């Protein structure tokens, strides 16, 4: 519910992603996403894990970090948009959760584009359209998200 030992299950689920080669795990992603929906009161530790996982983890795990962030991120704005959780204390709601990501989503995406392969870049890209459909305010779509620097650091062809 709060700073309980409940966190351990959320940690072990995140760690279960780190154990995979693809870093994605749809049912497990939905497990900690559903417990986060059942209790926004721990959004603070939850948001801390996605930014820390997404920044440290490998390229495939970065793709999986954005799947988690997409699931918990949209469902947080949607749930609070559907409920009185949009009118409560700052931490422990989508208010502080989308606020925290709104300042660092540039780190997660820009690194993930530079780290992940073209197919992974596309999975993130459909996630951005899905976020524009949900209306998440983390639209820090600066040129860092285009990551054109790391694109010039690598070979490419389209002609």
């Amino acid at each position: 519910m709060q700073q309980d030992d409940d966190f351990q299950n959320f940690v072990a689920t995140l760690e279960s992603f780190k154990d995979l080669k693809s870093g994605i795990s749809g049912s497990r992603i939905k497990k900690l996403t559903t417990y986060a929906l059942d209790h926004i009161d721990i959004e603070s530790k939850i948001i801390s894990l996605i930014i820390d996982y997404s920044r440290l983890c490998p390229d495939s795990h970065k793709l999986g970090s954005l799947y988690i962030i997409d699931s918990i991120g949209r469902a947080y704005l949607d749930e609070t948009r559907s409920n009185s959780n949009s009118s409560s204390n700052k931490p422990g709601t989508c208010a502080h959760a989308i606020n925290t990501l709104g300042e660092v989503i540039q780190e997660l995406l820009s690194d993930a584009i530079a780290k992940s392969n073209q197919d992974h870049k596309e999975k993130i890209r459909m996630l951005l359209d899905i976020w524009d459909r949900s209306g998440l305010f983390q639209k820090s779509y600066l040129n860092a998200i285009r990551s054109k620097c790391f694109a010039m650091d690598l070979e490419h062809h389209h002609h």
């Binding site: 795990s25 749809g26 049912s27």
Partner: peptide, 12 residues
């Protein structure tokens, strides 16, 4: 590897 690997969100 395990689980619903390569999960896919969607919207119309």
């Amino acid at each position: 590897d395990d689980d619903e690997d390569d999960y896919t969100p969607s919207i119309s």
